[PDB]
């Protein structure tokens, strides 16, 4: 069952923006959003595909694990934090794409598009340039199919090892205090209109796991932190943390 709630639409127009924000309370197995046309909307995932890249390249062995350092290339971006060695688990906080970029280049277009596949992930298509496509190629996922992909993670369900997903699920970890645990991952969209901000991921309770995936306009990098702040805000309306 899906329900709409409106009225989570004021969190984005209080902000002079547009979105959409899909919940599904995983005990009851009920899905929630303010507008389930742009919840089945299909969008570019930008560096919200780090989860299933992270995944793909544990598995096949290009990651060894969560620890091996991945050089930097000595090429000044205009990102700082990009500029410096990552482990799987630096790279995925701070997005750093030409990481990641070498990983789809050593999985290969034939491994990528069969993971793909076997992960049932968006609409499966990978044409574009192997180690950009989630930027600017073909591949598209809603935020529905953003919460189907991550419920899957969750349970260890997705074909790949056990051990493969408790790894992403650890880098997937952004906050974590006494009364909840996000495990989650943005996304920030520009080469293709519309230009989007993505957050997904869950949260952990003590005895449930809401699931969330949001994307929003984003014309500005200025309005990024949106991402976090509008789905708190929603958490925070329907009590799921205080
Ligand atoms: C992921 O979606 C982007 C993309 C560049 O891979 C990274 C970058 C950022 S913020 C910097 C945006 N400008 C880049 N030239 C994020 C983010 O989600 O904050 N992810």
Known sequence: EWQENKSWNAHFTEHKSQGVVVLWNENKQQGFTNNLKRANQAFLPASTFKIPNSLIA???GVVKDEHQVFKWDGQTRDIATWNRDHNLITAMKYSVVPVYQEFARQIGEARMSKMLHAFDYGNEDISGNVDSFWLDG????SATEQISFLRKLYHNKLHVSER???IVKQAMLTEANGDYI?????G???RIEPKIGWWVGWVELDDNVWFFAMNMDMPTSDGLGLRQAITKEVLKQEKIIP
């Open 138 to 141: 073909g591949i598209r996922i």
């Open 188 to 190: 920030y969209s520009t």
């Open 182 to 186: 996000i495990r989650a991952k943005t």
């Open 164 to 166: 493969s997903q408790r």
């Open 58 to 60: 544990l598995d096949l």
